Design a protein around this nucleic acid. Structure first.
Length: 92
RNA sequence: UAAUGGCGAAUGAAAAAGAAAAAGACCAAGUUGAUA
RNA sequence: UGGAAGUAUAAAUCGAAAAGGUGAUAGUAUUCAUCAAAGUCUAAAUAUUACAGGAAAACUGAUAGCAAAGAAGUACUGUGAA
RNA sequence: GAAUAGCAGGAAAGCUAUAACAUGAAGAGAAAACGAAAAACUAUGAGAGUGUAGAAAUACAUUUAGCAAUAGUAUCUUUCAA
RNA sequence: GAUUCACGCAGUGUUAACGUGCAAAUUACUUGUCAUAUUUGAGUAUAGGGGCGAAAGACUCAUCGAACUAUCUAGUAGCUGGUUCCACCUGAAUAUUCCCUUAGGAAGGUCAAAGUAUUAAUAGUAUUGAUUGGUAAAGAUAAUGAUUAGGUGUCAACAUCUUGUCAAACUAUGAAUAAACAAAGAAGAAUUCUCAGUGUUAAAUACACUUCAGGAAUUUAAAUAUAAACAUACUUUGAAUCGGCCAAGUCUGGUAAGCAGGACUGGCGAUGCGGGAUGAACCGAACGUCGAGAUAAAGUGCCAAA
RNA sequence: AAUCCGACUGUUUAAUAAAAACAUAGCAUUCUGAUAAAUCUAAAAGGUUCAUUACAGAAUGUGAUUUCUGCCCAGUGCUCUGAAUGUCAAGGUAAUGAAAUUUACUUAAGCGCGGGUUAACGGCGGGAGUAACUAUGACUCUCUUAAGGUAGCCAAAUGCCUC
RNA sequence: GGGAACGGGCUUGAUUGGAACGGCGGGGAAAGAAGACCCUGUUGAGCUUGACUCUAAUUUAUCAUGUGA
RNA sequence: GGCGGCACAUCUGUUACAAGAUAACGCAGGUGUCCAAAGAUGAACUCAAUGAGGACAGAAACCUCAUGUAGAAUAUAAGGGUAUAAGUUCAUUUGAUUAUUGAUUCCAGUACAAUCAAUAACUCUGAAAUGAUGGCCUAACGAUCCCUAAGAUUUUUAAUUAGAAAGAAUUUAAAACAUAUUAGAUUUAUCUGAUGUGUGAGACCGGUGAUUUCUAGUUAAUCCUUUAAUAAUAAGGCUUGGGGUGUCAGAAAAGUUACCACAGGGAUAACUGGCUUGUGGCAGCCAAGCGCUCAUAGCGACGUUGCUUUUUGAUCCUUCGAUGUCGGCUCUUCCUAUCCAUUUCAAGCAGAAUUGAAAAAAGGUAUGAUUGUUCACCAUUUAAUAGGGAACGUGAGCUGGGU
RNA sequence: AGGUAGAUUACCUGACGUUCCCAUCUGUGUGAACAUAAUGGUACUGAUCAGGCUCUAAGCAUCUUUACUUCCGUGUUCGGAUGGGAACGGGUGUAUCCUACUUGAUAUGAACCUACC
RNA sequence: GGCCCCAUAGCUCAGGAAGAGCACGCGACUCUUAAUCGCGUGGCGCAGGUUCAAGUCCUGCUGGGGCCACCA
RNA sequence: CUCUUCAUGGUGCAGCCCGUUAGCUCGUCGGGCUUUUAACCCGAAGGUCUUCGGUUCAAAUCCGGCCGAAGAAACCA
RNA sequence: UUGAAAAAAU
RNA sequence: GGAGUAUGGUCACAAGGCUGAAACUUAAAGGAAUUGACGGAAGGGCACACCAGGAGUGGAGCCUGCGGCUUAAUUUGACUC
RNA sequence: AGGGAUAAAUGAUUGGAAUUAUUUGUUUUGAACGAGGAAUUCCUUGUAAUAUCGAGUCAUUAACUCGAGAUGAAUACGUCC
C-alpha cells in the first residue's frame, strides 16, 4: 500500500543493520538471445501456425508487489514480496 | 546413452573398443615442344 | 536432423582467396592439433518373400494349408476399374 | 550360443575358444572438483552345557553364547543441505 | 409462345388395385397435356471440394448434404455382444485423495497367493481410577431473543412482584450411549552400596539427560475380570471393486410417495433351507453325502404332518 | 357469386411434396476501352465469354400492365478526384564496441480522421408542454444513434390476448 | 395375488375329450428395423461466421546492373 | 436436457446424531480485499448505558459526580477471545529481516498452503523479566516448461622473496624450423635447395641435487560450464522471489443442423402402467347465522375428518437390437357418485310444477351449424337427451383432418 | 494483633448499617530540586502537625449472590430386545443407566513464606 | 401460480423535522362579458413494529396494472 | 504491452505548445425596447480550467505516476 | 437586413 | 353559398374534358364613384425630431410618489405621450 | 482632512400631545460611492449649466413648485436618417 523509502534493516553482506533504500521491482525487458526465446523462434518458423499455447483466460485483477530493499553502502539488494494489493504507493 | 520434445506423448545417433574382408588407381592444372 | 545462436539439401540475393576447412555455445584475438573441399573409377566382406532349380521341417491334412490337391484367377457378376 | 574362429562327421544339432563388452564390486554433486572404520557401541534376542526334581513325559535353578532382525548410537565419503 | 380433340406423354385424384406385387415404383379409371421455352435417335463435350442444375441439395449406372472401386487398414472405440474341462480351499467393493472428472482412470481400503520372525508383537469386551464433550432433557426477568395477562408505585409510560407459553442457527445445569488414558516390557519388580560426563545453578552433594549412564550385592515372578500358539507381528506381489438396494422404538427437504439425501447396525447383492399361500431383503437358521433323535420360527376342522 | 397467391405459356424434389416454389418478359443497380471485366489451370508463345467491342461483355435484386416507391450516411460494407508525418514490415542509413550484438533516424500498402453512397447490409423509439365539456394533439422545445413508420394495408398464408 | 409395480409357466382357485375345417381380427406387450424423437460419447459430417490457427487468388515496398543528360 | 444458479477453490453458525468423520440445486451469510500502521513494544486511561446537576442547549452538542462484567470497541461475514486489555490516547521503532533444523493441519500421511517448537546472527521496545520471523483466531489463493530480478568477495590456489625439513628423478634407431652460412633465381605483400649449431633431449657421483611440504609477507586470480588452452562480450548452470492458469493439482477454442450420421442408455425425457393426491371431483362431523317466527324443509360460515384416480402435478421402477404416438367412425362390456322410467319417505308439498333422500344398474339416454379438436357455444327434438373405465378400450378394424 | 509477597480465585462478590488502632498500614502536611500533567486532583519527591473520618481488617442481618447436603425423582430422557398392542399418530412390558429447574437445611473462607508488635 | 410495481383532495400526479394543476366559492379588472390574476375551501388503503418524530424504514392483509415459458 | 490524443459553469464549445490571475450561446433572475404580447438588447450569478507533485516571478496551460475514455499495432508462462 | 399578432356586442 | 360538387352518360393511356343537380343554409353577396382614415407609395415643406455638441438620468446614500408584500386598517382617484 | 449615511449620549423651540426620533444645537460614531451597461431626457443666447435668494403650503417642518437675480460654454445656421 504505502511503504516509505529509507528503511533500516539487516544486511546479510555487512552482517549489520544499515540504512536501505526501498524501491519497487519491475520486470525487465525480455532478452532476444535467451534459450527459451531462441527455441521458440525456431518453432514458429515454417508452416503450422501457432505452435505454443496462448493464455486467454486471465482471472487475477492484481499482482503481488516485490520491493528492492537495497544496501546504501554495499549495494546488496533484497527482494521482499508483499500481499496482493490493488493500490500501492511509495511514501515519503 | 548424449541430445531432441506443448522438455508432454514420444523421437534418438556417433568416436573409441572387438571382428568379417582388404587394394588402390587416375583426369584437370603444371612441364616437353622441327609439337601429333 | 539427436545436432541444441543451425547437422544436411534447395531456392532469392550476395559472393572469396599471395589459399584455406574442422576442433558442434554465438563473437574477436593469439597460440595449438589435424586435414587440404568444390572432377572420376575401384574388387572382397553385405541384402533378397520377384522368378527358376533343389534340400529340409516338433508346419496344415480337403470348412485346414496359397484364392486354387480336378480344363483355378477357372465358373459366375459388373459399362468399367475391379 | 557378441560378433567371430576352429574340431570331429557328411551335422541349422554337439564341443572348444584368457574375450570386447553387459550387470555388479562405491557413493554423493547440476558441475568443477572429490571419494568412506573408533579393526565399532548399546538393548532384546537363536543355540549349548550342569544340577535337582516331578519322575514316563517334562519342568525349576545356574554357567556360557551372541547369529538374523528391529531401533538408537559414536566415526567416515560426497552435497548449500543427509 | 390463342381454345380444344387424336397418335403419344405425364402423373392431379381415387390417398382404388397390389403391397413376401406383373413391377426393388407397376396397373385401372379420372385428370392434365398433346409442336416452336415442342418430342425424340445417334454422334460428341463436361468427372469427384469435380461436373451439370428454369434451383428440389435435385441428377452424376437401383449408390449423393460429396459416386464407384482398391490401398493405408485387422483405422480408433472410456461403448455393445461373446470368451470353451472337473473337483477342493480361501473369498470381496459402492469410504478417502487427484483427474476436461461424473458410462472412465491412478494413490488407498476390502481380498488372494507366495515368503517369513520366538514374538517391547493380542483385544469392535467388561470392572475400578482420573478425565473430554454439550446431544436428549431442562430454563423462560438465569444471560440473548419470542410471548399472555394480573397486582403494587409515581391515561399511558417507566420501574418492581407474579402468571401462561417458546427457540436448528438461545443458554446456566446436564445425562444414556460414547472417545482417549492407567491397572508394572531397554525387554518381570524392588531395595542398599558405589558412582561418572556434560549442563542448569550463586555454587552446588539439589536437579536434567545419559541402555531408571555404568558397576556389585540382597530379595523377588506380585500387581482387576474374560478370551487368545494353526496366537501374534507381518513382508512382497497382485486380482476384482468404488451404478448399489432394503429394514428401522432414526434424521433432513417435501402435502406425500415403492420420492431425494444422511448417522449407527444388520442384511440382499454373493444365499440356498423351514415358516409367512405366492415375495431379494421379514421370522428361524446359513448348506460335504447319509441314518436316527430331540428342536427353532410357527402351527394342530379338511386341503396339511400335528 | 366471391376471397387469397402467382401476372400469363413454361420447369421442378426419377421412387410419399407439381405448388403460392423456380423460370419468364418488364424495372433497376455495378464494373470494364478490349494488353479490359469475369474467370479455369501447378505452369504455360495456356484456356472460356470472344468468329466478340459499350444497342457489348460480366456480376446481381425485384418479378407482366396501372399507381407509388416515403425519411435516415450514426454503425457495417463499398468508394474518393481528398489531408498528413496518428499508428503501421523486411529493408536503407548512421553511432558505439575487438566483433556478434545493441541504439537511433527514415521508408509502402493497410487501418484511423475527412467527403460520397441505401433499387448497398440495414433502421424507422422515448420524454415534456399545448385547442373553451372531457379526450386526442394540428404546434413548439427537445436526448440517445442518423431519422422516428410516410403513401398505403390489416385479426391478412402476417394479431399473443382472440372464438 | 405377489413379482422388474400389465404372467402361458409361479401360489390359490375356476375349469379341461383326442384330432381339426371355414371365418375373423382381442391377445401372443405378433412380424418387419442394433429408435429416426431425448440424452450420454472428451465419436463425426454438411453449412455459417472478425470462433482459434492457417492458405490459394488480390494487393503493396525492396532485390534482381540497357544506354545519355 | 436447455435457460437459471455455482452447491467447481474457499470461511462462519445450523442440519449434525455431547470423540473423529459426515448428504442434498438444505437454511442464514461470507472471500478474491484492506493496513507505515490497522505491525512490534512501553506507559497512562476505561468502554456502551443510566441517574443527578450546568447559559443558550431542546429527545441528540460539551462539562462534573455516582452506578456501571463489557450490555462498547476490536477493517470486514459469523462464531469464538479480550478490562491495571487484545479497546482508547501518547512515545520509540521496522522482527512485515538472514541462515539451518524438527514437527502439526487437509494428507495418499504427495506437492502447494497454513500452523508451530528451537538454534546461529543483527536489531526494535522496555528499568527489567520478558515480547517481536506481520495483522487476536478460524477464508483472503496457485504446478512442469518459459521469461524476469536477487545471491555465491568468508575460502582455496598459482608465481616470486626469507627461513626450516624431507628429495635419482629409468636407460641406446627423431621430425618442426626461431635463428646463422652458402647455392639457383625474382623484383615482389619475393622465393626455392643444401650443409653447422642449439632448441629437446633424458643413464649424478654418504654428498650434491631436479621436485613437493610448513611458516611470514607481497602480488594476481577466487560460485561452476561453453569438452585443445586463455581472455572482455554473450549464453547455459545452482538457490530464492515475481509474471497463472477463478474449469482455482493448472487444454490455447464460436454456432446451427427439420438433410443429418455412428457407438450406446430405460444410468435419462416425451405415452400407458405402478407409489403419492398437493391440485381436480365427491362425501361427511360441529353449529355462528340465513331461511318473515324457527341453527338442522332447504343451506350451512369459522374449524375439521375422509374417499376416488375420470384433471394436472411429483418421481423415474418396467420398456431406447421400437409396446404404432390425438380425435372421429364401428362394436361389446363394466362402475354408480342415477338423467328417465318402477317402488318409497320428507317439504316453508292445497292442485299442478317442483326440491331433498332410500331400494334398484335388468331397459333407454338423440338430430344438426362452427372447430382436427377433447372441450365449448348455439338451434331443435325427447320420458331423459347422466357422469366415467376397459394399455387416457378400439390403426395386421378404418380415416390421416391435427401433430 | 499488623504489614509485604502470594497460591485457591465470590464460603473471597454487592447493598444497609456497626468496632478498635497500642505498634503497622492508611488517610494527612508541602512543593525547592528528580520527575508530572490544562489542574501538586493523579503520578513524583520532601516530611510528621494533627485523625481513626474514609480506607484496610473483624463482626451483624429470617440480606440478594455464591459453595456444599437431602429432597425434587427413580420423575424427563436413554442403551438392548417381539410374529408385543394401534388404521395412523404416537405410547407399553422386560433386563438396565438416570440428569436438570425448584424448594428446605448449613456455611460466608481455608491456607503458605518474611519482618515487627 | 411466480416476479416487478402502484394505492394520496371531487379528478390527474408530487412528495424522515402534505403539496402542483384541473373542480367549487370569493375578490381585482371592464360600460357589460369573455379571458387573465390573487385568495380560500377541498386530504396519504388498512393493522402493527423501531425511532423523541413516518405517506417517507420494515412486516402481514386488501385491490389494480405490465412481464417470463424450447425438443419432444 | 508500445505509440498518440482528449478532459473547462447545469449543458456544449473557446483559450495562448510558454505563463501572469479564463470567455460565447443555451439554462436562471432582473432591467431595457413596444400601446401590449412575442421576438430583440443588456447586466448579475454560475468553473477556477479532473487529482497530486516538480517548473520558475508566477501553470488550464512545460514535465512526471495517478486517475477515465479514444485511435493504430503486437501477444509461448 | 429583420417589422408576427390585437377576442364578441355597443 | 352548397358547386361545376354528387349521380347518370360520354371522350382520354392518364391527368382530366363535355353534360350536370338536389338536400341544406343564409339577408345579404356584389358594381361605380364620394368623403375620411391608413400605406414597410411618390412629391414639397416643418419641429431639439435628429445631426455637431453641453448637461445629464440609469451605477451609490438619502428625500418623495407608484406597484407589490404586510396588516385591524396600511383610505382613494389617475397607468404611453 | 473627499462623502455625510446609519447609530449613542445629551440642549432647546412649536404643539393640548413630539413615542414610530416634528425641526434643530454640542461631542462621538466615519458606510456605500474611484464618474456610472442596455437604454433614455432637456436644451440654440444672458439660453444651458453651476451655486444661491423670495414666496405657496406654514402652530413647527423642503431635498417640491412658482418666481428672482449672480457667473456665462461648446456646438447648427442644417436634413427628413
Amino acid at each position: 500500500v504505502v511503504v516509505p523509502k529509507t528503511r533500516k534493516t539487516y544486511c546479510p553482506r555487512c552482517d549489520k543493520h544499515t540504512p536501505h533504500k526501498v524501491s519497487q521491482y519491475k520486470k525487465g525487458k525480455d532478452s532476444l538471445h535467451v534459450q527459451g526465446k531462441r527455441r521458440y523462434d525456431r518453432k514458429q518458423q515454417g508452416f503450422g501456425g501457432q505452435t505454443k499455447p496462448v493464455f486467454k483466460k486471465k482471472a487475477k485483477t492484481t499482482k503481488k508487489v516485490v520491493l528492492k530493499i537495497e544496501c546504501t553502502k554495499c549495494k546488496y539488494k533484497l527482494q521482499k514480496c508483499l500481499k496482493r494489493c490493488k493500490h500501492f504507493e511509495l511514501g515519503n
